[PDB]
Amino acid sequence: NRREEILQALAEMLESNEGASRITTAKLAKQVGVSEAALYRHFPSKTRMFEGLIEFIEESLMSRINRIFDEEKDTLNRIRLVMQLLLAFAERNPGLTRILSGHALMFENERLRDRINQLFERIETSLRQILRERKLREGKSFPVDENILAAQLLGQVEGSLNRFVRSDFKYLPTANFDEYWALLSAQIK
Amino acid sequence: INRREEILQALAEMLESNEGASRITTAKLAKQVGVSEAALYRHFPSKTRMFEGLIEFIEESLMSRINRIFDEEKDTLNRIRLVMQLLLAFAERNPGLTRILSGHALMFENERLRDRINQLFERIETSLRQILRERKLREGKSFPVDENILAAQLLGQVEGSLNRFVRSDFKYLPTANFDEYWALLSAQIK
Amino acid sequence: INRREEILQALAEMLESNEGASRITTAKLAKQVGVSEAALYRHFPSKTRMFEGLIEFIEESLMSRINRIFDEEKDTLNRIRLVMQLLLAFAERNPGLTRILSGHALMFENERLRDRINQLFERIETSLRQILRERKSFPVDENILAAQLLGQVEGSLNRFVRSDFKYLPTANFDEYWALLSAQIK
Amino acid sequence: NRREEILQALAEMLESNEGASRITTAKLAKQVGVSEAALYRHFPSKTRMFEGLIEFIEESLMSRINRIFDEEKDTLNRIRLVMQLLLAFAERNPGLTRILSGHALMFENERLRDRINQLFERIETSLRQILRERKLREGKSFPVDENILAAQLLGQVEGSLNRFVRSDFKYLPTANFDEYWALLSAQIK
DNA sequence: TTACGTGAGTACTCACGTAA
DNA sequence: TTACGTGAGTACTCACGTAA
Numbered sequence: 001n002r003r004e005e006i007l008q009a010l011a012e013m014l015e016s017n018e019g020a021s022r023i024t025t026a027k028l029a030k031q032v033g034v035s036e037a038a039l040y041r042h043f044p045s046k047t048r049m050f051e052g053l054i055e056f057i058e059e060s061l062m063s064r065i066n067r068i069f070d071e072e073k074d075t076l077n078r079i080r081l082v083m084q085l086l087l088a089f090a091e092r093n094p095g096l097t098r099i100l101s102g103h104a105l106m107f108e109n110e111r112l113r114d115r116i117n118q119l120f121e122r123i124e125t126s127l128r129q130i131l132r133e134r135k136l137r138e139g140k141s142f143p144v145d146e147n148i149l150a151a152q153l154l155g156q157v158e159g160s161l162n163r164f165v166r167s168d169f170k171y172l173p174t175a176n177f178d179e180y181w182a183l184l185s186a187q188i189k
Numbered sequence: 190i191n192r193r194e195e196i197l198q199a200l201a202e203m204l205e206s207n208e209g210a211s212r213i214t215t216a217k218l219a220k221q222v223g224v225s226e227a228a229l230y231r232h233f234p235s236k237t238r239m240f241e242g243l244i245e246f247i248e249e250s251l252m253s254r255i256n257r258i259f260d261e262e263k264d265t266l267n268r269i270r271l272v273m274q275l276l277l278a279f280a281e282r283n284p285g286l287t288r289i290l291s292g293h294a295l296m297f298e299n300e301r302l303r304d305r306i307n308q309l310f311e312r313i314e315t316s317l318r319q320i321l322r323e324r325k326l327r328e329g330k331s332f333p334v335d336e337n338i339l340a341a342q343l344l345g346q347v348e349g350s351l352n353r354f355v356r357s358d359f360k361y362l363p364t365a366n367f368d369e370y371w372a373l374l375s376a377q378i379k
Numbered sequence: 380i381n382r383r384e385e386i387l388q389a390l391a392e393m394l395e396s397n398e399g400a401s402r403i404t405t406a407k408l409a410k411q412v413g414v415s416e417a418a419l420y421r422h423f424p425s426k427t428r429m430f431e432g433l434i435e436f437i438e439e440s441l442m443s444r445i446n447r448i449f450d451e452e453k454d455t456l457n458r459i460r461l462v463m464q465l466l467l468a469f470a471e472r473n474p475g476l477t478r479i480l481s482g483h484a485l486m487f488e489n490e491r492l493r494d495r496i497n498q499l500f501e502r503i504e505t506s507l508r509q510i511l512r513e514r515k516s517f518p519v520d521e522n523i524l525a526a527q528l529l530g531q532v533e534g535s536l537n538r539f540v541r542s543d544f545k546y547l548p549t550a551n552f553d554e555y556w557a558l559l560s561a562q563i564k
Numbered sequence: 565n566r567r568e569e570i571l572q573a574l575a576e577m578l579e580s581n582e583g584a585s586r587i588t589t590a591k592l593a594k595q596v597g598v599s600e601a602a603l604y605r606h607f608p609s610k611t612r613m614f615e616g617l618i619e620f621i622e623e624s625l626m627s628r629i630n631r632i633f634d635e636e637k638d639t640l641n642r643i644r645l646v647m648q649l650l651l652a653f654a655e656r657n658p659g660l661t662r663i664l665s666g667h668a669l670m671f672e673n674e675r676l677r678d679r680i681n682q683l684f685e686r687i688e689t690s691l692r693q694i695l696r697e698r699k700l701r702e703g704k705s706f707p708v709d710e711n712i713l714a715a716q717l718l719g720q721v722e723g724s725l726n727r728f729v730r731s732d733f734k735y736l737p738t739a740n741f742d743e744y745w746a747l748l749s750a751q752i753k
Numbered sequence: 754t755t756a757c758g759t760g761a762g763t764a765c766t767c768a769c770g771t772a773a
Numbered sequence: 774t775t776a777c778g779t780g781a782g783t784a785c786t787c788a789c790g791t792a793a
Contacts, residue, residue: 035756091262117356143373151366164309183339235765400672410704520743527744532723534726538715599775601774604770
């Protein structure tokens with residue numbers, strides 16, 4: 001549980017207004033209430049601390065993506081749920097969002113970006129999968145090719161999250177989601 | 190100035206390389222310009238001002254062409270098309286500056302700078318809101334939702350493409366698939 | 380304690396040496412302790428705080444000894460003799476710290492520190508002003524005599540510093556006080 | 565006049581609040597009106613700039629002191645005059661006073677401070693000389709040794725100078741000089 | 754786990770060059 | 774004399790190291 005106390009505090013730091021700046025191992029140490037070397041007994045480096053946060057984000061998102069594939073069998077509903085999950089997750093975890101948008105990683109090992117790109121590739125592939133199953137489940141397909149649309153949907157989400165982090169979390173992603181979904185539906189249907 | 194511009198350029202170039210993902214120290218920048226750190230401060234009071242100048246080029250260059258589009262293109266639908274097609278093309282020809290546009294390169298500098306870029310986006314979205322309201326009130330195009338929701342999605346695709354351009358180390362072109370994207374975004378406002 | 384006190388000791392030591400006539404950089408101060416520059420910052424947030432640590436010691440030492448003079452010596456003229464003596468003896472026993480009282484060492488540091496030393500002298504002069512009202516002898520003005528007195532002392536501290544610590548502040552104090560006390564009744 | 569224009573400028577900055585800190589050549593150039601390369605074709609180093617200021621002070625003061633020996637033949641009056649001359653010069657030159665007390669010399673080459681110690685030595689010798697001539701002139705000497713007395717008199721002056729610069733030029737050196745004198749003569753004579 | 758600590762860096766400064 | 778510098782600092786920071 002100790003190993004989690006660290007990742008949880010690191011997450012709380014990124015959420016606060018301090019998350020906009022470099023989270024020093026000393027400041028992180030003050031949140032956990034332990035010494036600096038007390039952190040380096042669960043994590044070889046600072047980068048492993050982020051690598052663990054990233055894994056968490058991926059775990060939540062992909063798991064829930066799959067749950068939707070089993071729970072819901074209607075194509076449009078599937079896209080709706082995934083779009084909502086992505087924006088809602090970002091809204092409940094502003095600090096983790098700073099890692100998804102890649103701003104918090106600016107101060108860390110530039111290789112962590114590979115994990116971020118692999119996470120996005122999983123979301124995209126998942127999105128693409130849902131769209132492909134339409135002609136089979138409904139007979140109809142989409143105006144644009146599945147790959148293009150998957151990328152288009154993923155782009156709107158990244159853009160939406162970049163604004164969230166940009167505005168200092170003032171611009172909420174899920175606020176007006178219903179009207180937004182109604183817009184996509186009229187576009188995708 | 191000659192040497193003054195050599196600085197800004199040196200910066201933009203570094204922002205394009207793989208170093209753009211990490212902090213650009215004055216030591217590294219000085220080397221890239223082939224001068225001493227002191228020479229740097231002779232053209233700029235602080236590292237921040239150096240970035241400001243780049244942002245100044247972005248604000249001017251973008252607001253320049255956006256104004257030209259209004260005096261030239263009058264059709265509300267195509268103006269909206271050219272607006273974002275400009276941002277995507279501008280970012281694609283200025284990879285390094287995109288890191289400023291997405292706000293990643295400005296994490297090592299004064300907050301005040303990021304504000305400068307947030308405003309740049311506020312204005313761009315404000316214009317889109319205008320163009321959409323006119324198309325609705327003058328051409329009676331009954332949208333299935335508020336202009337804010339539409340202008341928000343149009344800006345989302347753009348930022349979505351800027352950030353992904355950065356993620357992939359500039360491998361995924363922001364203008365890629367634009368035409369297809371537009372055929373799905375315009376259908377609800379034609 | 381162990382290291383925080385060691386640093387303040389190193390700073391005073393350098394302030395006493397020939398290095399005190401020049402800026403005491405952290406690189407150099409760090410070398411005088413046997414540790415790295417980063418090491419200094421674990422006990423002090425700024426170089427300014429290091430100097431405040433010394434200014435506090437100077438204050439605590441001077442003011443507390445002045446309160447002991449009052450409760451031990453009841454004679455007015457002796458009180459005055461003893462206070463001036465304390466100031467000159469303090470500086471003579473602490474060459475480096477005098478470099479601070481004279482204000483030359485603070486030229487390389489935060490302006491607020493010089494503000495502190497002025498505040499300390501006001502205190503000294505005030506307590507010296509109070510004593511002179513216990514009188515008296517020869518049209519005397521408390522406010523004026525107190526300034527002359529603290530002034531004389533201050534002149535002794537600068538002569539001590541600028542003279543590379545050769546002109547001891549307490550030298551000839553007995554003669555100086557002989558002529559003064561006699562004419563001041 | 566350019567050489568002098570630099571000296572006045574520097575003198576002026578030493579007289580302002582900036583005098584409390586390092587007077588960079590960059591700023592000295594600004595004040596003068598010319599460039600940094602200009603200031604240097606008139607002065608080899610920055611130390612030559614302060615050296616030329618110590619020279620003004622040295623002559624301003626000794627020439628006056630020698631004139632006193634010649635113009636006044638009463639011992640006490642001779643002492644009164646020199647002490648007044650010293651304090652009066654300081655008061656009229658707040659800037660150069662940051663040099664005499666040595667505070668402004670902390671940013672420059674040590675040599676400059678050894679020269680100041682030479683100046684004070686010439687001053688003290690003057691006093692020590694004026695005092696020795698009392699037995700011959702009046703047949704009476706002082707109740708204290710000429711050395712000790714001289715060192716004490718100059719000390720009062722250095723003290724007044726230190727307070728003047730200290731108080732940001734609020735404590736005037738010539739202030740209440742008359743009271744100090746009334747009590748001094750009373751101690752000697 | 755805490756005590757005690759540091760190599761490499763980090764934005765910025767200053768008195769003082771030198772070539773045509 | 775301009776144009777165009779710079780070697781050596783400066784106070785202060787940080788992720789990660791070593792021994793009890």
